[PDB]
Point group: C5
Chain length 206, copies 5
């Protein structure tokens, strides 16, 4: 307990908080999705509800320490409010995202952070034809709302969404699910913004 | 990180917070809407639900800095709680607005701020006839709740609402969408209040 | 900005906050309602939903200043959390009131405050007969929850509810709407409590 | 204002906050219910919704003062966050309780506190037969969640629930309503725990 | 009041807060469920809603005191925000858990804590066949979201869920309910994570219907 308390005090109580990335100190966030359930479709509003968890990974020099100086501590858990976290946002949500897991991240001695929020999302999706053999395809982009590609870049480790925890008795079966880096431009701003496009093809289970 | 931390400390930790505009130091806020979806209509209550984002821009002398003195930083992202923001309010809402994006603004060295909240709004609108060829027209005014035209003026850069991100598979198609500065008077107060009137004509998609 | 910052610091950062009215220092709050919409009726639960705004006015000696000493500032806007506000409560609500406007008040140099919260209220009301020519009458009392008439008195400037912003395409039309001071007694307490009784007669629009 | 400010500063800013009752310093809380409305019954889930207010009374030596020393102040209103309040909990709720009144208590010079929260509660209740002459009976226990009878005792002043403000046009009429102290054990804990059992018999209004 | 105020000040205002368990100082949390009601089933979304309370118990050396030095105080109630609490999470929830009881724990002089949150949970469960005699079986895992088995272990005192407070007029009757420690692995992480698997068999309360 003593060494960890000392480590946390040194990382968090001495300097001002990390002010986020800049054009001079850009950051790459690795994203990956684990899809748990397509919980419902609303054919009267063209909204669909997903439950998933989103693995986020990034690295900051300001979170580095030498384990020798702190009783061989190589990592620790801490409230996400203690650290900067990326503002990864769904671009076609129709309701605020609901948080289904504790807001706690794991920080490692090399300055790397792992944060894996479980979420329920309602997003824009037309489910007409979901009861057919061909099913339907829907898509939602996830990216920083406020940081361009000059401050936050994104990547995935694989373009295949993890389906190994998908609910076996869901009303919907997944035909395919991919997660792919894209570049986009917006009216507000001349700079490219980066997103990961989650594309899910599904149909009613036989 | 170092120069930005120094800049933020200088802008925010030395003076009291900006106390908002006054008759002596008035402020002009530029508004623009990007309409993403008419998500639903409730013909039993005459309420309609929109998802959009609202670009807000204003300029304060108290947020100016010389980039030379701060490692050539020309802008930065910061929590909207760190700065004053205008109290732009829908005048015919029937529920609290739901926030769909992070509360983070971009501040630029000339003292200009850009803040772009994504919102879901339920407002007063009679959808009778939406299933016809002619469709229906609805309107909602956005403006300061508490500041008259002597403290906050509004403008738009264009009268045309941005429809380039409108959801292509929405239940409703947009026939027209405009955003227009207006002056209004209220029983409480002799002074003019300024709003931007969002006027949307829509119908059920064919 | 400078003079206002100085004024706010002098009013709020020197003394403890105003502790509310007392039997020795009683307060009169002026109330007035502006009815915007009867949004829905639920005939299965006898609940009706109103959207309105409630103009509240009171005066404190502790909020007085001389404009000469503060750059001719005669009024200012400030967060309602900076000041004491009266605990005006609907007596037959069935849900928490939903807040539809920013929590910001206007303070004037004579010590007077104006605070105008927009609200959506569900309250107890039997709508049986609303679809007839005669319509139905409903009523809800607004008053302090915790302060008797010895600490908070209420008045209205007029007994006529302001209907000039009533939604023209509402499902319901207003036949009459009055706001009237009353005295009431409760089992807990021997002292009179004051309320303003909002009485609305309405029917389904032709 | 001056004397009250001084009294509040002396009661609240000098000592640490009251840490709650103990086996050495136990407390008796007096409870009483005022039933306003049975708002709805859900026969598909066996949940019923009540609106009531709950009068709570207790006495602390640490809230005593001599009125002579404080300009003859015999009582005052204060935010419930300034004081300890008992953790009175419904034992068969199905949703979080909704708060319908301001969180403000009245403290009197003898150290007694009166706090009267208005609440909407959904609780477990089978309404089958409510449309008959005999009606149905339902019950819910209210008590401390965490303090045994050695720290918190409860009493009522009467076993009759106050029905004098019951909504006259409710869908349901009340045949009887009682509030009765009970002692229980729970598997977690060896000590007796005290509750007040609210028993309501009702039927659909003729 | 005086001795307790002194005890709380000594436990909470002198050191930094307990930073949670570590591989060097692991912690075992005991869990047990008391099922109060299956409030509803949604056959169109395969979601079911439970109301229960979850007894959590753990022990920290940093919460120990000598009762002799504090007026013979052997335990006290305190806000759960004053102490570290384990991040026990349902693994197949479809909505945020709703809290139905005050967030207050009981701390005892040996450093043991008891915290018993009442909760309403919506979780993934197919109720097809609930209206039959055999009923349906559903399951939900509860465990730390972020701590592996090297930092947080779990146990139960019994594998039988407490059903003695189950609502007698519920729409659903419980046939059986068990709570069992399990080990699981996740894609993110090589380390084992521990959960307690809550398995409930239930059916509609129907006529005065027999269990065969
Ligand atoms: C940490 O690692 C060093 C180097 O191997 C070892 O000698 C020491 O015993 C360890 N210290 C602790 C506190 O585990
Ligand atoms: C700012 O720009 C100048 C060149 O235009 C460069 O020499 C200087 O090093 C820059 N400052 C920093 C901190 O990078
Ligand atoms: C206040 O009003 C007086 C009288 O007109 C004027 O001379 C003075 O300049 C004003 N003060 C400021 C700070 O504008
Ligand atoms: C309090 O009451 C005493 C007794 O009559 C009186 O003499 C004193 O002036 C009072 N003080 C105030 C502030 O009312
Ligand atoms: C504490 O315990 C001792 C031993 O039983 C007893 O004599 C004393 O009165 C107790 N109470 C205190 C210290 O308040
Ligand atoms: C890329 N974002 C999404 C839409 C607007 C844009 C943006 C840019 C800067 C600050 N806020 C929002
Ligand atoms: C312009 N607002 C709209 C209606 C009330 C008015 C207002 C004015 C001052 C303070 N609050 C609200
Ligand atoms: C006037 N209110 C309505 C009924 C209870 C009463 C009251 C009085 C004092 C403190 N809280 C509530
Ligand atoms: C008396 N309560 C009701 C059920 C559990 C119990 C309890 C006791 C101590 C801390 N939390 C809950
Ligand atoms: C065991 N957890 C649940 C799924 C991912 C994993 C995890 C690990 C670290 C931080 N958050 C979540």
């Amino acid at each position: 307990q003593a060494n960890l308390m000392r480590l946390k005090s040194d990382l968090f109580n001495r300097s001002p908080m990390y002010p986020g990335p800049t054009k001079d100190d850009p950051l790459t966030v690795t994203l990956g999705f684990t899809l748990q359930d397509i919980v419902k479709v609303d054919s009267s509003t063209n909204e669909v509800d997903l439950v998933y968890y989103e693995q986020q990974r990034w690295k900051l020099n300001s979170l580095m320490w030498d384990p020798n100086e702190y009783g061989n501590i190589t990592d620790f858990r801490t409230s996400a409010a203690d650290i900067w976290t990326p503002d990864i946002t769904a671009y076609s949500s129709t309701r605020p995202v609901q948080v289904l897991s504790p807001q706690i991240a794991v920080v490692t001695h090399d300055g790397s952070v792992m944060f894996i929020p479980a979420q329920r999302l309602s997003f824009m999706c037309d489910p007409t034809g979901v009861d057919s053999e061909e099913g339907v395809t829907c898509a939602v982009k996830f990216g920083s709302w406020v940081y361009s590609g000059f401050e936050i870049d994104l990547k995935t480790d694989t373009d295949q969404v993890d389906l190994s925890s998908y609910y076996a008795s869901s009303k919907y079966e997944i035909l395919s699910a991919t997660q792919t880096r894209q570049v986009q431009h917006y009216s507000c701003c001349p700079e490219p913004y980066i997103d990961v496009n989650l594309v899910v093809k599904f149909r009613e289970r036989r």
